[PDB]
Nucleic acid binder design. Structure first.
Ligand SMILES: CCc1c(C#N)c(SCc2ccc(N(C)S(C)(=O)=O)cc2)nc(N(C)CCNC)c1C#N
Ligand SMILES: [Zn+2]
Ligand SMILES: [Zn+2]
Length: 842
DNA sequence: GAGGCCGCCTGC
DNA sequence: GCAGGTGGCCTC
C-alpha cells in the first residue's frame, strides 16, 4: 500500500475521521505542510497548496483540504512574475490524498522592519530581478480586481485550530457580509414583523436612515403627457449643404440623452418581514417601506429646476413605496436643513452621501413646506508631485485634506511658475527627474539653485503622471522600444518610489497606459511595485463621474506600503453617459474591473456645460482682457463651488484665441442646434473681416462609396477617391468655407465628426486639450452660442479648477496648463480614498 | 506663430 | 463598417 495514517483519530465529525499526520510512500505529512498536486492534463504545471486538514471519509477514503497558492504567472503579472513567487488567494477545496505529488517548501518573505530604507534597486533589478531560488510568497491577491495586498491575519477558534482554513473562514465572512439580514426586532403586527435595524454588504440601516434605490424602484405621483420624439430630420438643400449627408449616424457627440437617472432617495419608515401564517417572520424576504424624496427635476418643474438648486437638495414627500431590501444600493444621510448645528455648506463638505431638505413638496397642490414634525484631524502627508504641471493633482489632494505638496518637479517653466503661484510653500524643481534622483543618490543635499533636495523619510506620498513617448503603441515591445521604456520617465518615477518608499503612491496616465505594448507597460509597472514589496492595484476612472462636465478617462495605479491599507477606487458620484464609462481592462484575455459597484446609477445628477459656464459674460473671438466683471452672482451649484465663498470682484483669464478671419467666418456659420459641426457649413462665398473672400468648395472626382448628390453632383474632391491613384494637386482648393481636407480624407476618419463642433448646454465637453483648435481631432471646441472657441476660463471650469486657481504665461501657455492637468475633483475623490486608509491604519 | 493636414490600430 | 484612442508635425 502507499498511504497510512499516523496515530489515532482526533475527532469523528460524522462520516469524517480527522488525523494529525499521514504517511505517503517515503514522506510524512502534517497539517500546515505544503504540497504539489498534478493537474488533470500533465501539460499544465503543478498546483501548489497548503494542507489544512486530514481525514478518512467513511465512503470516499483518504482526504485532505488544500488551500491553493496562486502562481505569479497566473496573476496579471503573467510571465513578468518572479518564476518562484506565489500569491495567497481565497481558493481551496477538499482533495483525495492520492492527488498529492510531492511535499514542497514555501517560505513567507515578510518585509523587514527597516523596509522603508531598503530602496535603491537599479531599474534592471526592479524590472527583471528575481529572488533567491525557492518558492516564496509575500502578498495576497484578488484575482477579479487585480489587487496585491498584505496577507490577512485571521485567527482560529479553539475548535477550528485542528482543521482551520483561513480561505474557508474568509469566504464564510464574505458570504455572511453579503447576505441581507435583519438584526433587531421592533414590533409584532398582525401580518408582518417590524424591525429597527438590518444590515447589507457591511452597511447598517436603521429606521429613519436614508437609502439609495435604483431609478426603477418606484415612480412619482407625476401624471405627465409624453414628450415628442427625436428631431424629425427634415430634408435640406444638398447644393447649399454638400456635406450634411455625412451626418447619417444620428448620434450626438457629447450628448446627455443617454445618461441614466440618479438614484431614487428614500427614508426608511419600515423594515419588515412577512409573517408566515404560523407566527414566524420570513427573514429571507426583507422589505422596506420608504417615504419618497423628490429631486427638483422630479417635480412638475422639470429639468430646469435643477439649474440653480444645490446638487444635494431634496424635498420631503409623503408618497410611500415598498421595495425589497436587496434593492438598496447604499445608505445616505438626509437631514432637515434648519436643525443642523453647522451650516449647510460645512455639512455638505464634511462627509459623503449627505443630502438636506428645507421644504416639502405637496405633489398635486404643487406646493412647498408640508408636515415637518416627523423630520427630526490627521497630519497631512508630505507629498512629492512629479510631472506636476500647474498642479491639478496636488490641488485635488489638498482639497481631500491628505497632503501638503512640499516638492514638485515640472520641467516646463510656465507650468512650474503656475505651480509656484498657487503653492508658495512648495519647492519646485525644473530640472530632469533623473538628474535630481542621481544627485540625491550621490549624497547631494541641494540642487544647483540651492534648493534643498528631499531625502529618505521626507517623502510620505509620491504622485505623478509620467509621459510615455516612444512606447505608446499597441504592438509588442522590441529591443529598441524596450530600451526606451527602461530609460523612460515611467521607470524613473518607479525608481523614485523605490528610493523614497512613501506610504502611498499614485501614477496617473491616459487610459491606454493599461494597453500600451500589449499591456506590458502596465504589467512591468506592477511587477516593479511588487518587487519593491508594495501593495498595489490598477484601474480606469472617468472624470465626469466625479463631477466635471467632461469625458476624460484616466488609468490609475495605486500602491501602499507594507503596514498600510491599500486604497479602494472611489465610487462614482455623478451619473454620466454610459458609453464614456467603459472602465474594464483586458490583460492576456483576463478581464479586470475595479471595486466600483455603482455601475448603472449614482447619487448626483450629471454636471453639464450649462452648470460649467452659463454664468460667464459674453466675449468675442480673440478676447484678451485678463480681468473683467462677472456681471452677476453664480447661477449653478457648480459655479458656486468653483467661485468659492469669498466675493470675487474680478473674473480672470476669460480670454480666447484670436482665430483667423476664415476660421471666424466658419464658426459664425456653425448652427447652434445640438450636434452641429463642420458638416452643417454652407457652400457659399463669404466676405471675410479682412476684405478677403471665402470660396465655394466644388468637387473634382466621383466618390463611388458616398455616391453622388441628391441631384447629381459629385461628392469627391480628390483623385484620392479612385482608391489606387495618387493625390494630384489640381484640386487643392484653398480658402474654402467648407474646409477642403475634411472631405479629402473624411471617408477614413468617421466623417471628421465633431470638427468645428459646438458644445451643447445640456451636454458635456469632449476631453479638454492643451490647444483648442476646431480642425483638430478634439475639434468640438466652439461655444454653444458665441462664435468663438472656448476660453481659458471655460476650459479651466471643464476641468473643475477653482476660479481662483492661478495660471501663468500667454494664452497658449495657459491653455496647455489647463489641458495637461488632472481635474481636481477626480484627484479629490482619489485622495479621500487614501484618507480612509490613513484613518484605518492599525 | 496658426492652420492645414492627417496614420495605424483596437473593440465591437 | 462604425466608433474611438492617441496628439503633433511643418509650413507660410
Ligand atoms: C485623428 C488625428 C491623429 C492623431 C490624434 N489624435 C494622432 S495621435 C498619434 C499619437 C499617439 C500616441 C502618442 N503618445 C505618446 S501618448 C503617451 O499615447 O499620448 C502621441 C501621438 N496621430 C495622427 N496621425 C496622422 C499619426 C501620426 N502622424 C504620423 C492623427 C491623424 N490624422
Ligand atoms: Zn478552505
Ligand atoms: Zn488626395
Amino acid at each position: 500500500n502507499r498511504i497510512s495514517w499516523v496515530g489515532e483519530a482526533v475527532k469523528t465529525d460524522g462520516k469524517k475521521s480527522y488525523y494529525k499526520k499521514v504517511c505517503i510512500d517515503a514522506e510524512t505529512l502534517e497539517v500546515g505542510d505544503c504540497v504539489s498536486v498534478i493537474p488533470d492534463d500533465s501539460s499544465k504545471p503543478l498546483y501548489l497548496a497548503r494542507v489544512t486538514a486530514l481525514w478518512e471519509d467513511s465512503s470516499n477514503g483518504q482526504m485532505f483540504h488544500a488551500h491553493w497558492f496562486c502562481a505569479g504567472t497566473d496573476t496579471v503579472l503573467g510571465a513578468t512574475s518572479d518564476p518562484l513567487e506565489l500569491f495567497l488567494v481565497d481558493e481551496c477545496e477538499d482533495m483525495q490524498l492520492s492527488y498529492i505529488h510531492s511535499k514542497v517548501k514555501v517560505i513567507y518573505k515578510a518585509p523587514s522592519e527597516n523596509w522603508a530604507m531598503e530602496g535603491g534597486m537599479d531599474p534592471e533589478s526592479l524590472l527583471e530581478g528575481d529572488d533567491g531560488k525557492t518558492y516564496f510568497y509575500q502578498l495576497w491577491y484578488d484575482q477579479d480586481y487585480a489587487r496585491f495586498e498584505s496577507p490577512p491575519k485571521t485567527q482560529p477558534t479553539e475548535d477550528n485550530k485542528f482543521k482551520f482554513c483561513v480561505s474557508c473562514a474568509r469566504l464564510a465572512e464574505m458570504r455572511q457580509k453579503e447576505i441581507p439580514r435583519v438584526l433587531e426586532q421592533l414590533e409584532d403586527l398582525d401580518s408582518r414583523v417590524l424591525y429597527y435595524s438590518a444590515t447589507k454588504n457591511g452597511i447598517l440601516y436603521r429606521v429613519g436612515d436614508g437609502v439609495y434605490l435604483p431609478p426603477e424602484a418606484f415612480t412619482f405621483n407625476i401624471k405627465l403627457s409624453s414628450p415628442v420624439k427625436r428631431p424629425r430630420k427634415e430634408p435640406v438643400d444638398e447644393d447649399l449643404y454638400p456635406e450634411h449627408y455625412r451626418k447619417y449616424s444620428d448620434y450626438i457627440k457629447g450628448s446627455n440623452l443617454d445618461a441614466p437617472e440618479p438614484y431614487r432617495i428614500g427614508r426608511i419608515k419600515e423594515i419588515f418581514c412577512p409573517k408566515k401564517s404560523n407566527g414566524r417572520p420570513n427573514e429571507t424576504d426583507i422589505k422596506i417601506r420608504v417615504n419618497k424624496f423628490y429631486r427638483p427635476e422630479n417635480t412638475h418643474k422639470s429639468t430646469p429646476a435643477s439649474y440653480h438648486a444645490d446638487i444635494n437638495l431634496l424635498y420631503w414627500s409623503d408618497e410611500e413605496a415598498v421595495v425589497d431590501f436587496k434593492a438598496v444600493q447604499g445608505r445616505c444621510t438626509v437631514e432637515y436643513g434648519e436643525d443642523l448645528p453647522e451650516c449647510v455648506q460645512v455639512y455638505s463638505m464634511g462627509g459623503p452621501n449627505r443630502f438636506y431638505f428645507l421644504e416639502a413638496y405637496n405633489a398635486k397642490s404643487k406646493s412647498f413646506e408640508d408636515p415637518p414634525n416627523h423630520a427630526r484631524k490627521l497630519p497631512k502627508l508630505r507629498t512629492l508631485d512629479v510631472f506636476s504641471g500647474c498642479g491639478g493633482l496636488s490641488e485635488g489632494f489638498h482639497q481631500a485634506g491628505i497632503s501638503d505638496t512640499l516638492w514638485a518637479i515640472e520641467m516646463w517653466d510656465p507650468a512650474a511658475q503656475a505651480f509656484r503661484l498657487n503653492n508658495p510653500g512648495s519647492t519646485v524643481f525644473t530640472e530632469d527627474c533623473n538628474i535630481l534622483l542621481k544627485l540625491v543618490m550621490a549624497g547631494e543635499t541641494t540642487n544647483s539653485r540651492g534648493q534643498r533636495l528631499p531625502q529618505k523619510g521626507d517623502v510620505e506620498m509620491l504622485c505623478g503622471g509620467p509621459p510615455c513617448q516612444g512606447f505608446s503603441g499597441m504592438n509588442r515591445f522590441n529591443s529598441r522600444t524596450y530600451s526606451k521604456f527602461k530609460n523612460s520617465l515611467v521607470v524613473s518615477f518607479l525608481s523614485y518610489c523605490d528610493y523614497y518608499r512613501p506610504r502611498f503612491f499614485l501614477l496617473e496616465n491616459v487610459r491606454n497606459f493599461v494597453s500600451f505594448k500589449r499591456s506590458m507597460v502596465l504589467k512591468l509597472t506592477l511587477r516593479c511595485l511588487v518587487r519593491m514589496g508594495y501593495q498595489c492595484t490598477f484601474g480606469v476612472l472617468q472624470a465626469g463621474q466625479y463631477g466635471v462636465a467632461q469625458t476624460r478617462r484616466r488609468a490609475i495605479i495605486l500602491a501602499a506600503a507594507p503596514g498600510e491599507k491599500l486604497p479602494l477606487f472611489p465610487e462614482p458620484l455623478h451619473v454620466f453617459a454610459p458609453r464614456a464609462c467603459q472602465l474594464s481592462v483586458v490583460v492576456d484575455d483576463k478581464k479586470f474591473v475595479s471595486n466600483i459597484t455603482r455601475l448603472s446609477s449614482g447619487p448626483f445628477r450629471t454636471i453639464t456645460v450649462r452648470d460649467t459656464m452659463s454664468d460667464l459674460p459674453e466675449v468675442r473671438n480673440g478676447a484678451s482682457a485678463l480681468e473683467i466683471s462677472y456681471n452677476g452672482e453664480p447661477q449653478s451649484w457648480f459655479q458656486r463651488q468653483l467661485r468659492g465663498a469669498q466675493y470675487q470682484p474680478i473674473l480672470r483669464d476669460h480670454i480666447c484665441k484670436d482665430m483667423s478671419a476664415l476660421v471666424a467666418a466658419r464658426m459664425r456659420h456653425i448652427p447652434l442646434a445640438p450636434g452641429s459641426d463642420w458638416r452643417d457649413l454652407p457652400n457659399i462665398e463669404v466676405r471675410l473681416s479682412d476684405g478677403t473672400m471665402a470660396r465655394k468648395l466644388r468637387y473634382t472626382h466621383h466618390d463611388r462609396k458616398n455616391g453622388r448628390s441628391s441631384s447629381g453632383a459629385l461628392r469627391g474632391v480628390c483623385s484620392c477617391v479612385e482608391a489606387g491613384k495618387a493625390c494630384d494637386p489640381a484640386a487643392r482648393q484653398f480658402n474654402t468655407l467648407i474646409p477642403w481636407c475634411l472631405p479629402h480624407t473624411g471617408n477614413r476618419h468617421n466623417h471628421w465628426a465633431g470638427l468645428y463642433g459646438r458644445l451643447e448646454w445640456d451636454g458635456f465637453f469632449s476631453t479638454t486639450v492643451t490647444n483648442p483648435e476646431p480642425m483638430g481631432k478634439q475639434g468640438r471646441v466652439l461655444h454653444p452660442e458665441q462664435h468663438r472657441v472656448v476660453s481659458v476660463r471655460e476650459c479651466a471650469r471643464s476641468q473643475g479648477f477653482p476660479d481662483t486657481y492661478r495660471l501663468f504665461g500667454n494664452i497658449l501657455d495657459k491653455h496647455r496648463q489647463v489641458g495637461n492637468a488632472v481635474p481636481p475633483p477626480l484627484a479629490k475623490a482619489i485622495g479621500l480614498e487614501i484618507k480612509l486608509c490613513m484613518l484605518a491604519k492599525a
